[PDB]
Design a protein around this nucleic acid. Sequence first.
DNA 1: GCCACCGGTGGC
DNA 2: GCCACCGGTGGC
Length: 45
Amino acid sequence: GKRKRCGVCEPCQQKTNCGECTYCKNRKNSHQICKKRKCEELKKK
DNA sequence: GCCACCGGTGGC
DNA sequence: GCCACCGGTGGC
Ligand SMILES: [Zn+2]
Ligand SMILES: [Zn+2]
């Protein structure tokens, strides 16, 4: 295996959740990070 | 065929 | 136990 976030992309440097995406609005049930914090390198295969 | 997203689970 | 990657696929 599993890749780790890069830690330096703009999403990785975000310090707070966007509060408006589907994953933010469903935080208590979602297994997914805020769409605005998802690492740009993890979006690539 | 695309892609948002469910949910199993690896890594800590 | 929590976080959130990632395989698979429902819904389009
Ligand atoms: Zn968000
Ligand atoms: Zn990153």
